Each structure stands twice: as structure tokens, then as C-alpha cells.
């Protein structure tokens, strides 16, 4: 067969493509306005919504007809979205090309590897999931110098769309679960994995859904405000921007480190702790946000907690319901993050504008993270289902 570490590289490739898709709009804000920032951000909001919703059908189709078809279709759709975003002329044009097509393909690329990589690593599920999701923290590090090299804009859309289509087709080409019988390794009761209908009907699934929505919303609601908070406190734009930039490093690193850490010690308490820490960070920025060092610390903590969500929620869902229906279960679960990605940033901006001050959005995010802390800490796994219909066999 093939080594079980190959799916990790595949998910790295696919998630890196998705990260390039998500990082594109920030590089395009200035060039596109050259020919309103909020008008541009509407395309990104559409992209987030489409992405986060298309995970659900992507997960169902991955569970039904395998993940290769889904990821490669996603690569086609995204590549089309980017290459067509390159040939745009109107606002709605970019909305469709980037937000819808590219977002569609991006969701279809993102989900199947998150579902597949743990299947090869039953001994290290959270780490493998982290490899399936760590590419999104990379999009900035690879694209930003690349995008600057191309511009210093349509060239970015076209060539990046080609490269992303290629990486996604490579990742999806070699992507498939292990064979049904044997699992890569080095009268009784027979348990079994939950069905998608059994998981979707479970109450803890929606407690996790609610926690996910809250965490994603709070993070997306304040991250855009971190550097503006620093400038309001008295820092120079350069200093505040430098301070907030460490959030990318922590957001990327946490996806692998938290995965490995909970593989070793368990999910629930570390996860709840990270949420608590995010709560404290939303509150603490008011004391630490006015100096490069303090603002950097808050950005790192926000990045760590936020990023950890995207390993720990799929790892938690895998713990609860098992991996056979993980495509459907986590695809459904991720739509929470899709909705938050649509609405959260706008709400943060609106609250700040409404009051003129940062207390309201940060305090609202702290409340959401408190709720998430409570849910994540108090939710223990459900009863492992038994296959009585398979149990009967031991005479
Ligand atoms: C952003 C917050 C969104 C919270 C959504 C909570 C949904 C709770 C009600 O849903 C229903 O729950 C049943 C089992 O509990 C399922 O059988 C059913 O399919 C589902 O429709």
C-alpha cells in the first residue's frame, strides 16, 4: 500500500490551497479599490459563507462516493473561481467568481482531508486532523511574498488560481481512506460508530455546534480590531501591525501542537482551558493593548485559541461519534463556522461604530467565549453505540 503519512501531506497541500484562497482578499483590498473597502469585504464574507456551508455537502459526498471526487471537483471549482476572478469587471462579478465559485471549491477541498487524515492515524487522530487543517495558517506565509512579487493584480488571481487548482488536484488525487478490513498498525460487546442521523440527532452535537459558533464569532469579531485598538492606545501603525502579526504564527502552530497535546492528554479540559484563556484575552486587551509587547501577547493568545478550535472541534466530534461518519458529522458541524465567518466581522465593526469604542465588541466576544468555555467543559462524550445486530454473532 502507501505510507500513512502521505494523507498528512495531502491535507497540508489542500488546506494550504484553502489558506491561499482566504488570504487573497487582503492582498486584493488595495489594488481593487485602485480601479470601497467594505464593498470588497462583501466578497470575502460571501466566500466565507459559501465555504463554511459547502463543507456539509462536501462531507456527505465524501462519505458516500469517497473523498477523491470531492476534493478534485473542489480544485476545479476553486481554480475556475480564481482564474475567473482574474477576468472581472464589476462588483457582482467578483462576488460570484471569488465568493461563490472559489468558496465552493474551497469548502470541497477543505473538508474531505480533515475527515480522512485521522482514519490513517487512529493512534494520533488530533495530530492528523491538525495536518489536515494546518495549511490555512500557511496561506499568508506562502502567498504574501508571492503576491507582492507578482504585483510589486489580475496576475495574482490567474497564476494563484492555476497553482491552487494544481495543488488541490494533487492532494485529492492521492486521497482515499484505508481499505475497509485492515487498519495500519505496527460473549463480548461489539460497539460501533454513530450514524450521521444518530449524530445529527444528538444533543451534544448541537452543544458543540453552539460552542463552535460562539468561538468562531468572537474571534472573527475582534481580530480585525486588534491593530486598530493598538493605534487608538497611542502606538504607531507600524508598531501595532508588527504586534498583531504574531497572531499568524500562533494560529498556525496551535493547529499541530494542540492536536499532538490532546492526542497525549485528552481533549476536553485543554479545550475548555483555551476557551477560558480566550475569554480572559478579550478582557485583558484593555490592560495590555497599549504597548507592542502587551498587544503582541494578546494577539498570540487569541491566535493560539482561535486556531486550536479547528483541530479540537473535529477531534472532539471524532471522539464522540467515531470516524466512519466523520465526513458528514464534521461537515454539518463546520457550517457554524461558516455562519460566523459571514456575520462576525461585520457585527464587530458595527458595534464599534455604534458606540465609537472597543468595549462593546471585545466584551461581547468575551461573553461568547465564556459560554463556549462552559459548553466545552461540561460536555462529556455520549454513550458508545452497540451493534446488537452484530453482537448476535457470538452465538
Ligand atoms: C447559531 C445557533 C444554532 C443552534 C441550532 C440548534 C438546533 C437545535 C434543534 O435542532 C434540531 O435538533 C434535533 C435533536 O436535538 C434534531 O433531531 C433536528 O434534526 C434538528 O433540527
Author numbering: 7 to 41, 45 to 161, 167 to 200, 212 to 420
Task: List passages from the publication reporting this PDB structure.
We have identified a transporter from Syntrophobacter fumaroxidans (SfMCT) that shares 25 and 27% amino acid sequence identity, and 51 and 57% sequence similarity with the human SLC16 family L-lactate transporters MCT1 and MCT4. In summary, we reported two structures of the bacterial SLC16 homologue SfMCT in complex with the monocarboxylates TSA and L-lactate. We have presented the structures of an L-lactate transporter (SfMCT) with two different bound ligands. Both structures show SfMCT in the pharmacologically relevant outward-open conformation, which is an essential prerequisite for the design of L-lactate transport inhibitors using SfMCT structure-based homology models of human MCT1 and MCT4.
To understand the binding mechanism of L-lactate that bound to the purified, detergent-solubilized transporter with a Kd of 2.84 ± 0.15 mM, we co-crystallized SfMCT with its transported substrate. Two molecules of L-lactate (i.e., Lac1 and Lac2) were found in the binding pocket (see also Supplementary Fig. 5c,d for electron density and omit maps). The carboxylate group of Lac1 interacts with the Nη nitrogen atoms of the guanidinium group of R280 (TM8), while the hydroxyl group is hydrogen bonded to the hydroxyl group of Y119 (TM4). Furthermore, the carboxylate group of Lac1 is in hydrogen bonding distance to the hydroxyl group of Lac2. As observed for TSA, the Lac1 carboxylate group is sandwiched in the confinement formed by the side chains of L145 (TM5) and F335 (TM10). The phenyl-ring of F359 (TM11) points towards Lac1 with a distance of 3.4 Å between the C4 carbon atom of the benzene ring and the methyl-group of Lac1. Most residues involved in ligand binding adopt similar conformations in the SfMCT structures with bound TSA and L-lactate. The exception is L28 (TM1), which is rotated away from the central cavity in the presence of L-lactate. This removes the binding site obstruction observed in the presence of TSA and generates space to accommodate Lac2. Neither Y119A nor the conservative mutation Y119F showed any [14C]L-lactate transport, which is in line with our observation that the hydroxyl group of L-lactate interacts with the hydroxyl group of Y119 (TM4).
